[PDB]
Every structure is written in C-alpha cells, then in structure tokens.
Amino acid sequence: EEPGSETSDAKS
Amino acid sequence: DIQMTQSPDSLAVSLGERATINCESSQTLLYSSNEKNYLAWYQQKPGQPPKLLISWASTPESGVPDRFSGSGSGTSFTLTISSLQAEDVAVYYCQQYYNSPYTFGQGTRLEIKRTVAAPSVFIFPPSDEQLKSGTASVVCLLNNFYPREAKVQWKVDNALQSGNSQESVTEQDSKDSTYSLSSTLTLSKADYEKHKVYACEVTHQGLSSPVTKSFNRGE
Amino acid sequence: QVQLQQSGAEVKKPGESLKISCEASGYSFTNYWIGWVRQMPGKGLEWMGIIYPGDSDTRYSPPFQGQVTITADRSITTAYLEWSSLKASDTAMYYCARVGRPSKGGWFDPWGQGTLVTVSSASTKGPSVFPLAPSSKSTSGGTAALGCLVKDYFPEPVTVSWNSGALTSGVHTFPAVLQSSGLYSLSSVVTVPSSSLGTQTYICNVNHKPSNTKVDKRV
C-alpha cells in the first residue's frame, strides 16, 4: 500500500 | 509481516576483490509516491554494536568509505564493496523500515578468502590435576587453517564417539586470515582409565587425507 | 551529542523478572521512536519493538508480542524492556537503539552499547585451570602447542593472558562453550618453537571476576 513508517507510525 | 532474506549467509572474498551481498524482501519497499526504498544496511564487527552504513537503499552515511555502495529497488537490493579491504570483515544486515515490525535480514558474514591452509593438529591428554576430580577432558587443537569448515572425530580404543564432544572456533585471524578450532572430549575419569588409545581424526580441504593424532594413556 | 546508556550486564535465574534500562540524552526524548534489538549468542539481530515516549504508543514484532513489555519514563528520559518470567533462551545481548529520524518510523541510529543478559539455573563458580602440556620433545626442530583448560565456571566471562602479557604471538583463546551441565569451559592455547620447551617457562594467567578467582598455572 504505502509505508507504515510514514503513516501509522508517524507522529507530531 | 515483511520477511528479509539475505544471500549468501556467508561470503568469502579475496582482498581487493568485489564483494556482493544481496537482500530480498517479500514485499516491495518502494513507496511509489516519493520513489523511495525503505531499506537500510548495517555493519557489525565482532564485539561491537551494529553501525548504520546506508539508508534509503542508495545513500551512505557520512564517512562511509567510497568502496561501499548500495543499489537496487523494489524487492531486490545489493550492498557492494568494490574492493574488499581487511577492515571490512564483518556481518552485514539489511533492514526494511517500510512497515512495522522493521525486520532485519538474517545477516551475511563476510570473511577474507585466502589460499587453503591445512590445520596443524595437536592432541592433549587430561592432566593429572584434572584426573583427581572424577572428570577427564581430552582436547584436540586444529591450528591456523582455512577455510573454516573442518571435521573432528574422536576415537577411544577405535570406538567412534558421538555426543560427548564440544567444539569452539576463533574469529578469523587479523594477520593471517586463518581460523583455529578447539574440540574437547568429555569422559568420566573411570572411563578414561578403562581405555588406552585416544585419537582425534581431522578432515579438512587442505589435507590430502584425514590426519589422526593419537596418544596411549600412561604412555 | 546523542548517547544511549544501557544498564549493566544481568545474570538471572529462570522465572525471575527483569527490567533493563536505556538512558537517552542529546536529543528530544519524546520526538523519537526508541526500541530494542535482541542478539542471541552467535546469531543475528532481531527487531523486538519500539516505543514513542511522546504518547507511549508501542510496536512489537510477533515473536515478542506478549513476551516482553517496552515502556518509557519521560521524566528521566529512560526506556525499558521487561520480562515477567525469564527463561534460559532469553540469554542474549540486548541493544537499545533510537530510530534515526524524528517523529516517524525508520532505521536505527544510533545504537546503545548493549546489555548482556544471562539466564541460567547455575550459580556463580570459579574455574579450575588445568595445564595442556606441550608433549612434542625439545629436539624435534618444529613447533609445539601448549595451553590451559579453563573449565567449569559461571558466569561469563574469563580473561586469559600468557606470561603476564609478554606472550601474545601465536596465542589463541577460544570462545567459551556452555557445557550440558550448565557451566562454561574454554581453552587458551599457544604455539611456540619446540626448541624453547626446555628453557622458557610458560604460565597462563586466568581471571574470573564474578568469583574473584585469579589463577596462574604453570605449564
């Protein structure tokens, strides 16, 4: 799909 | 869960020659949107923590020597050492950081390939001191050989032993690129004194036929 | 700059609990994922999981899901790895490592120096040091091998020197092997000219810190 490390794992 | 498969498990390259380490992912690590490959390479020297060499597949950390390059895309990646130097002997790991868990490859052990060298074989009876304690250890030393593969078989009054030996092998020697191996046969003290002939037979590429070093208990 | 200071080596009995720590400095502790990597003796890196101290969110790889717990303490910038009931196969090196870029997933950089965890039912015991005597007569004109068998200690590690450090050429000190009895054993060997056997004296110096055993063995 698209990388978890840029999405589900990304933080603010 | 993305699986990372490196090849080969172990790699022997002559000094000054090209070393190629492959890494294959079960899913693509290419993010089509930014065209980036979510793949890192690590180098781990013995006794030390891993060190990052390459991120984003094709991108070395600062200070990484120019003989290192990373290539590939999608599911197929390659770490290249253009000209292998002594300082490069290590285990190399790839790692995907596309989807958690950020799994590592299983590691590729890179060693120096040198000319075949046969072991020097030495056999050591149990010491009188140890004999005191109802334990006997018979030690067989294989010294300064290459490649690292070797077979030790223990014979006691010509009866082949199995299960009662343990081996240990050194790191590849930094100056001569050979290995050494130690094999310890464990017997009860009383068994040791029930038998007479103790022999370790060694098989290795560098030996034209297997060598036997023996002794007779009590000379 | 960035430092990841891990707690000291642990030696534990199976069934005990254990929490190891990694103290971070040099960056904003809550803006980076931070995690743990296991390396069992002689094997590869295994990504265990990571924690984002900004919101305590965690990720685990399946083999460690439900085995360990990773936490963090924002107030002391420290991350933790915890087992409820250690087993023997938890024996391994454990690296703490920070993800190499803030606020997102990715590779690990930098790494801590590691915490060695030994889980065994064995209790501390100093080694017995036995001579491995040369055997090869002084008038052979060749090379002789001799050594010391450092047998039956717990836990790791032992150090071996020869002639108090004046004998380093030709010395091989092998990695310890775990015997089936649960005690470690290793040999240190050295090759020397046979012609030196009658004149030169050879003494191995064995230190085992955890038992405060120091032994000099003449061979």
Coordinates of C-alpha atoms in Angstrom, one line a residue:
Chain A
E1 CA 0.0 0.0 0.0
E2 CA 2.1 2.8 1.5
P3 CA 4.7 2.7 4.2
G4 CA 3.5 2.4 7.8
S5 CA 6.6 4.3 8.9
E6 CA 5.4 7.4 7.1
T7 CA 1.7 6.9 8.2
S8 CA 0.6 4.7 11.1
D9 CA 3.9 5.2 12.8
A10 CA 4.2 9.0 12.1
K11 CA 3.8 11.4 15.0
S12 CA 3.5 15.1 15.6
Chain B
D1 CA 4.9 -9.0 8.1
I2 CA 7.8 -8.4 5.7
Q3 CA 10.5 -11.1 5.6
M4 CA 14.1 -10.1 4.7
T5 CA 16.2 -12.8 3.2
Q6 CA 19.9 -12.1 2.6
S7 CA 22.3 -14.2 0.5
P8 CA 24.6 -15.7 0.9
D9 CA 24.7 -16.5 4.6
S10 CA 28.5 -16.4 4.4
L11 CA 30.7 -14.8 1.9
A12 CA 34.4 -15.3 1.3
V13 CA 36.1 -12.6 -0.9
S14 CA 39.7 -12.2 -1.7
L15 CA 41.4 -8.9 -0.6
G16 CA 41.0 -6.3 -3.3
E17 CA 38.1 -8.1 -5.0
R18 CA 34.4 -7.2 -5.3
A19 CA 32.0 -8.4 -2.6
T20 CA 28.3 -8.5 -3.3
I21 CA 25.6 -9.0 -0.6
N22 CA 22.0 -9.5 -1.7
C23 CA 18.8 -8.7 0.2
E24 CA 15.4 -9.6 -0.9
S25 CA 12.1 -8.5 0.6
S26 CA 8.8 -10.5 0.5
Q27 CA 7.0 -7.2 -0.3
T28 CA 8.2 -4.2 -2.2
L29 CA 9.9 -1.5 -0.1
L30 CA 9.4 1.1 -2.9
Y31 CA 7.0 3.8 -2.0
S32 CA 5.6 4.9 -5.3
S33 CA 4.7 8.4 -4.1
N34 CA 8.2 9.6 -3.3
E35 CA 10.0 6.9 -5.1
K36 CA 12.0 6.0 -2.0
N37 CA 13.1 2.5 -1.0
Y38 CA 12.7 1.8 2.8
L39 CA 15.9 -0.2 3.2
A40 CA 18.9 0.2 5.5
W41 CA 22.3 -1.6 5.6
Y42 CA 24.2 -2.2 8.8
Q43 CA 27.7 -3.4 9.5
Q44 CA 28.5 -5.2 12.8
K45 CA 32.1 -6.0 13.7
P46 CA 32.7 -8.7 16.3
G47 CA 32.3 -7.4 19.9
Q48 CA 30.6 -4.2 18.8
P49 CA 27.1 -2.9 18.2
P50 CA 25.8 -2.7 14.7
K51 CA 26.5 0.5 12.8
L52 CA 24.4 2.2 10.1
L53 CA 26.1 2.2 6.7
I54 CA 23.3 3.0 4.2
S55 CA 19.8 4.4 4.4
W56 CA 17.2 4.8 1.6
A57 CA 18.9 1.9 -0.2
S58 CA 21.2 4.2 -2.2
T59 CA 22.8 6.5 0.4
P60 CA 25.8 6.0 2.6
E61 CA 26.2 7.7 6.0
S62 CA 28.8 10.4 6.2
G63 CA 32.3 8.9 6.5
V64 CA 31.4 5.6 5.0
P65 CA 34.3 4.7 2.6
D66 CA 33.7 5.1 -1.1
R67 CA 34.2 1.4 -1.8
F68 CA 30.7 0.9 -0.3
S69 CA 27.7 1.3 -2.5
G70 CA 24.0 0.3 -2.1
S71 CA 21.9 -0.5 -5.1
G72 CA 18.5 -2.0 -6.1
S73 CA 14.9 -1.1 -5.7
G74 CA 11.5 -2.8 -5.0
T75 CA 12.3 -6.2 -3.6
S76 CA 15.9 -6.7 -4.7
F77 CA 18.8 -4.8 -3.1
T78 CA 22.6 -5.1 -3.1
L79 CA 25.4 -4.0 -0.9
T80 CA 28.6 -3.7 -2.9
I81 CA 32.2 -3.5 -1.6
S82 CA 34.1 -2.7 -4.8
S83 CA 37.5 -3.7 -3.4
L84 CA 37.5 -5.7 -0.2
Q85 CA 39.8 -4.5 2.5
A86 CA 40.8 -6.1 5.8
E87 CA 38.8 -3.7 7.8
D88 CA 35.6 -4.8 6.0
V89 CA 35.4 -8.2 7.6
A90 CA 32.0 -8.2 9.4
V91 CA 28.4 -9.3 9.4
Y92 CA 26.2 -7.1 7.3
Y93 CA 22.4 -6.8 7.9
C94 CA 19.8 -5.3 5.8
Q95 CA 16.6 -3.9 7.4
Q96 CA 13.3 -2.7 6.0
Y97 CA 11.6 0.2 7.6
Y98 CA 8.6 0.2 5.4
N99 CA 6.0 -1.5 7.7
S100 CA 6.4 -2.3 11.4
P101 CA 7.9 -4.5 12.6
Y102 CA 11.1 -3.1 10.9
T103 CA 12.6 -6.5 10.4
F104 CA 16.2 -7.3 9.8
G105 CA 17.7 -9.7 7.3
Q106 CA 19.4 -12.7 8.8
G107 CA 22.9 -11.4 8.3
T108 CA 25.7 -12.1 5.8
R109 CA 29.1 -13.0 7.3
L110 CA 31.8 -11.5 5.1
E111 CA 35.3 -13.1 5.6
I112 CA 38.6 -12.8 3.7
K113 CA 39.2 -15.6 1.3
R114 CA 42.8 -16.7 1.3
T115 CA 44.7 -19.8 0.0
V116 CA 43.7 -23.1 1.5
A117 CA 45.7 -23.9 4.6
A118 CA 45.7 -27.3 6.3
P119 CA 45.4 -27.4 10.1
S120 CA 48.2 -28.3 12.4
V121 CA 46.6 -30.9 14.7
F122 CA 47.6 -31.4 18.4
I123 CA 46.1 -33.7 21.0
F124 CA 46.2 -33.2 24.7
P125 CA 45.5 -35.9 27.3
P126 CA 43.7 -35.0 30.5
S127 CA 46.0 -33.5 33.1
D128 CA 46.9 -35.4 36.3
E129 CA 45.4 -32.4 38.3
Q130 CA 42.0 -32.7 36.5
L131 CA 42.2 -36.5 36.8
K132 CA 41.9 -36.0 40.5
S133 CA 38.3 -34.7 40.0
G134 CA 36.3 -37.6 38.6
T135 CA 36.4 -35.7 35.2
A136 CA 38.6 -36.2 32.1
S137 CA 38.8 -33.7 29.2
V138 CA 40.7 -34.7 26.0
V139 CA 41.4 -31.7 23.9
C140 CA 42.2 -31.6 20.1
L141 CA 43.5 -28.4 18.7
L142 CA 43.3 -27.5 15.0
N143 CA 45.6 -24.5 14.4
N144 CA 45.7 -21.9 11.7
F145 CA 43.6 -23.3 8.9
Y146 CA 41.4 -22.0 6.0
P147 CA 38.6 -22.3 5.1
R148 CA 36.7 -22.5 8.4
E149 CA 35.0 -25.8 7.7
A150 CA 36.6 -28.8 9.5
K151 CA 35.5 -32.2 10.9
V152 CA 36.9 -33.7 14.1
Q153 CA 36.1 -37.2 15.0
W154 CA 37.1 -38.7 18.4
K155 CA 38.0 -42.4 18.7
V156 CA 38.5 -44.3 22.0
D157 CA 40.1 -47.7 21.6
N158 CA 39.0 -47.2 18.0
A159 CA 35.3 -46.8 19.1
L160 CA 33.8 -43.8 17.3
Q161 CA 32.5 -41.3 19.9
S162 CA 29.4 -39.1 19.5
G163 CA 27.5 -36.7 21.7
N164 CA 30.4 -36.2 24.2
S165 CA 32.4 -33.5 22.4
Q166 CA 32.1 -29.8 22.0
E167 CA 33.9 -27.5 19.6
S168 CA 34.8 -23.9 19.6
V169 CA 36.3 -21.8 16.7
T170 CA 38.2 -18.4 16.8
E171 CA 37.5 -15.3 14.8
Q172 CA 39.4 -15.1 11.5
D173 CA 42.9 -14.1 12.4
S174 CA 43.5 -10.4 11.6
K175 CA 47.1 -11.0 10.3
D176 CA 47.0 -14.4 8.6
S177 CA 43.2 -14.8 7.9
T178 CA 43.1 -18.4 9.3
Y179 CA 40.9 -20.0 11.9
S180 CA 41.7 -22.2 14.8
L181 CA 39.4 -24.8 16.4
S182 CA 39.3 -26.5 19.8
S183 CA 37.4 -29.8 20.4
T184 CA 37.0 -31.1 23.9
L185 CA 36.1 -34.8 24.6
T186 CA 34.4 -35.2 28.0
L187 CA 34.7 -38.6 29.6
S188 CA 34.2 -39.9 33.2
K189 CA 37.5 -40.3 35.0
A190 CA 36.9 -44.0 35.3
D191 CA 36.0 -44.4 31.6
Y192 CA 39.2 -42.6 30.8
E193 CA 41.2 -45.1 32.8
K194 CA 39.4 -48.0 31.3
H195 CA 40.7 -47.3 27.8
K196 CA 44.1 -46.9 26.2
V197 CA 44.1 -45.3 22.8
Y198 CA 42.7 -41.8 22.3
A199 CA 42.7 -40.2 18.8
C200 CA 41.2 -37.2 17.1
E201 CA 40.9 -37.6 13.3
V202 CA 40.6 -34.4 11.4
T203 CA 39.2 -33.8 7.9
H204 CA 39.9 -30.6 6.1
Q205 CA 40.2 -29.3 2.5
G206 CA 43.9 -28.6 2.9
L207 CA 44.7 -32.2 4.0
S208 CA 45.1 -34.7 1.1
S209 CA 43.6 -37.3 3.5
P210 CA 42.4 -37.2 7.1
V211 CA 45.0 -36.9 9.8
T212 CA 44.9 -38.8 13.1
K213 CA 46.8 -37.6 16.1
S214 CA 46.7 -40.2 18.9
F215 CA 48.2 -41.0 22.3
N216 CA 48.2 -44.0 24.6
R217 CA 47.1 -43.4 28.2
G218 CA 50.1 -43.6 30.6
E219 CA 52.4 -43.7 27.5
Chain C
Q1 CA 25.8 14.6 21.4
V2 CA 23.3 11.6 21.3
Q3 CA 24.1 9.0 23.9
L4 CA 22.1 5.8 24.8
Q5 CA 23.4 4.5 28.1
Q6 CA 22.2 1.0 28.9
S7 CA 22.1 -0.7 32.3
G8 CA 24.7 -3.3 33.3
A9 CA 25.0 -7.0 32.5
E10 CA 22.5 -9.1 34.2
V11 CA 22.7 -12.7 35.4
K12 CA 19.4 -14.2 36.5
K13 CA 17.6 -17.5 37.4
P14 CA 14.8 -18.7 35.2
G15 CA 11.5 -17.5 36.5
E16 CA 12.9 -14.2 37.8
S17 CA 11.7 -10.9 36.4
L18 CA 13.9 -8.4 34.8
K19 CA 13.7 -4.8 33.6
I20 CA 16.7 -3.3 31.8
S21 CA 17.0 0.4 31.0
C22 CA 18.5 2.7 28.4
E23 CA 19.1 6.3 29.4
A24 CA 18.9 8.8 26.5
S25 CA 20.4 12.2 26.1
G26 CA 21.4 14.7 23.4
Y27 CA 18.0 14.9 21.7
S28 CA 14.4 15.5 22.4
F29 CA 13.4 12.1 24.0
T30 CA 9.7 12.4 23.2
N31 CA 10.2 13.2 19.4
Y32 CA 11.9 9.9 18.5
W33 CA 10.8 6.3 18.5
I34 CA 13.2 4.2 20.6
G35 CA 13.4 0.4 20.8
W36 CA 15.2 -2.9 21.5
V37 CA 17.0 -5.5 19.4
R38 CA 17.9 -9.0 20.7
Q39 CA 21.0 -10.8 19.6
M40 CA 21.3 -14.4 20.9
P41 CA 24.8 -15.7 21.1
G42 CA 26.2 -16.3 17.6
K43 CA 23.0 -15.2 15.7
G44 CA 21.6 -12.2 14.0
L45 CA 19.7 -9.1 15.1
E46 CA 16.0 -9.5 15.9
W47 CA 13.9 -6.3 16.0
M48 CA 11.8 -6.6 19.2
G49 CA 9.8 -3.4 19.2
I50 CA 9.8 0.3 19.8
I51 CA 8.1 3.0 21.9
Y52 CA 7.3 6.6 21.2
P53 CA 7.7 8.3 24.6
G54 CA 5.6 11.3 23.4
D55 CA 2.4 9.2 23.7
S56 CA 3.7 5.8 25.0
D57 CA 2.5 4.1 21.8
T58 CA 4.3 0.8 21.1
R59 CA 5.1 -1.6 18.3
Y60 CA 6.2 -5.2 18.7
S61 CA 7.3 -7.9 16.3
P62 CA 5.1 -11.0 16.6
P63 CA 7.7 -13.3 18.3
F64 CA 8.0 -10.7 21.1
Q65 CA 4.4 -9.6 21.3
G66 CA 3.1 -10.9 24.7
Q67 CA 6.7 -11.9 25.8
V68 CA 8.2 -8.6 26.8
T69 CA 6.9 -5.1 27.7
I70 CA 8.6 -1.9 26.5
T71 CA 7.9 1.3 28.5
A72 CA 9.4 4.7 28.9
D73 CA 9.7 7.4 31.6
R74 CA 9.5 10.9 30.1
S75 CA 10.7 12.5 33.3
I76 CA 14.1 10.7 33.3
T77 CA 14.4 10.2 29.5
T78 CA 14.7 6.4 30.0
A79 CA 13.3 3.5 28.0
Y80 CA 12.8 0.0 29.5
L81 CA 12.5 -3.6 28.4
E82 CA 10.8 -6.0 30.9
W83 CA 10.2 -9.8 31.2
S84 CA 7.9 -11.2 33.8
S85 CA 9.4 -14.7 33.8
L86 CA 12.8 -15.1 32.2
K87 CA 13.7 -18.4 30.5
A88 CA 17.1 -19.7 29.6
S89 CA 16.6 -18.8 25.9
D90 CA 16.3 -15.1 26.9
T91 CA 20.1 -15.3 27.2
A92 CA 21.3 -12.8 24.6
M93 CA 22.7 -9.3 24.0
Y94 CA 20.0 -6.7 24.1
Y95 CA 20.6 -3.4 22.2
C96 CA 18.7 -0.2 22.8
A97 CA 18.6 2.0 19.7
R98 CA 16.9 5.2 18.7
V99 CA 15.2 5.5 15.3
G100 CA 17.4 7.6 13.1
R101 CA 15.0 10.4 12.3
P102 CA 12.3 12.2 14.5
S103 CA 8.6 11.6 14.5
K104 CA 8.5 8.8 12.0
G105 CA 9.5 5.2 11.7
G106 CA 12.8 4.2 10.2
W107 CA 16.1 2.6 10.7
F108 CA 18.1 2.6 13.9
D109 CA 20.7 5.2 14.6
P110 CA 22.5 5.5 17.0
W111 CA 22.7 2.3 19.0
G112 CA 23.5 1.6 22.6
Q113 CA 26.5 -0.5 23.6
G114 CA 24.3 -3.3 24.7
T115 CA 23.3 -5.2 27.9
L116 CA 24.2 -8.9 28.2
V117 CA 21.6 -11.0 29.8
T118 CA 22.4 -14.5 31.1
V119 CA 19.5 -16.6 32.3
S120 CA 20.6 -19.8 33.9
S121 CA 19.8 -22.0 36.9
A122 CA 23.5 -22.2 37.6
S123 CA 25.2 -20.4 40.5
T124 CA 28.5 -18.5 40.4
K125 CA 31.5 -20.8 40.4
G126 CA 35.2 -20.1 39.7
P127 CA 37.0 -22.1 37.1
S128 CA 39.5 -24.9 37.6
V129 CA 42.6 -24.3 35.4
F130 CA 44.3 -27.3 34.0
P131 CA 47.5 -27.5 32.1
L132 CA 47.6 -28.6 28.4
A133 CA 51.2 -29.8 28.4
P134 CA 53.4 -29.4 25.3
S135 CA 54.3 -33.1 24.6
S136 CA 56.4 -32.7 21.4
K137 CA 60.0 -33.0 22.8
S138 CA 62.5 -30.2 22.6
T139 CA 64.7 -31.7 19.9
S140 CA 62.1 -32.1 17.2
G141 CA 63.1 -28.8 15.4
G142 CA 59.4 -27.9 14.9
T143 CA 56.6 -26.2 16.6
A144 CA 54.9 -27.2 19.8
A145 CA 51.4 -26.3 21.2
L146 CA 50.5 -25.9 24.8
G147 CA 47.6 -24.4 26.7
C148 CA 45.3 -24.1 29.7
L149 CA 41.9 -25.6 30.1
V150 CA 39.7 -23.2 32.0
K151 CA 36.8 -25.5 33.0
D152 CA 33.5 -25.3 34.8
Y153 CA 32.9 -21.6 35.7
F154 CA 29.8 -19.5 35.9
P155 CA 29.1 -16.9 34.7
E156 CA 30.9 -15.4 31.7
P157 CA 33.5 -14.0 31.3
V158 CA 37.1 -15.2 32.0
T159 CA 40.2 -13.5 30.8
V160 CA 43.4 -15.4 29.9
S161 CA 46.9 -14.0 29.4
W162 CA 50.2 -15.8 29.0
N163 CA 53.4 -14.9 30.9
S164 CA 51.5 -11.9 32.3
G165 CA 51.1 -10.4 28.8
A166 CA 54.6 -10.9 27.5
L167 CA 53.4 -13.9 25.3
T168 CA 50.9 -12.7 22.7
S169 CA 52.2 -14.2 19.5
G170 CA 50.6 -17.5 18.5
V171 CA 48.1 -17.3 21.3
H172 CA 44.5 -18.5 20.6
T173 CA 42.0 -18.1 23.4
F174 CA 38.8 -19.8 22.2
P175 CA 35.2 -18.7 22.8
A176 CA 33.7 -20.4 25.8
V177 CA 31.3 -23.3 25.3
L178 CA 28.3 -23.9 27.5
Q179 CA 28.6 -27.5 28.7
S180 CA 25.4 -29.6 29.2
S181 CA 26.0 -29.3 33.0
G182 CA 25.3 -25.5 32.5
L183 CA 28.9 -24.5 33.3
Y184 CA 31.2 -22.8 30.8
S185 CA 34.5 -24.1 29.6
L186 CA 37.3 -22.7 27.4
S187 CA 40.8 -23.4 26.3
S188 CA 43.6 -20.9 25.6
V189 CA 46.5 -22.3 23.5
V190 CA 49.8 -21.0 22.2
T191 CA 52.3 -22.4 19.6
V192 CA 56.0 -21.9 20.4
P193 CA 59.2 -23.4 19.0
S194 CA 59.8 -26.9 20.4
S195 CA 63.4 -25.8 21.0
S196 CA 62.1 -23.3 23.6
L197 CA 60.4 -26.0 25.7
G198 CA 63.3 -26.8 28.0
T199 CA 64.5 -23.2 28.5
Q200 CA 61.4 -20.9 28.5
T201 CA 58.7 -21.1 31.2
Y202 CA 55.0 -20.8 30.2
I203 CA 52.3 -19.6 32.6
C204 CA 48.7 -18.8 31.8
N205 CA 47.0 -16.1 33.9
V206 CA 43.3 -16.7 34.4
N207 CA 41.0 -14.1 36.0
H208 CA 37.3 -14.8 36.7
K209 CA 35.9 -11.5 38.2
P210 CA 32.4 -12.8 39.3
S211 CA 34.0 -15.3 41.7
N212 CA 37.2 -13.2 42.4
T213 CA 39.2 -16.2 41.2
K214 CA 42.7 -15.3 39.9
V215 CA 44.9 -18.3 38.9
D216 CA 48.4 -18.6 37.5
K217 CA 49.0 -22.0 36.0
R218 CA 52.5 -23.1 35.0
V219 CA 52.6 -25.5 32.0

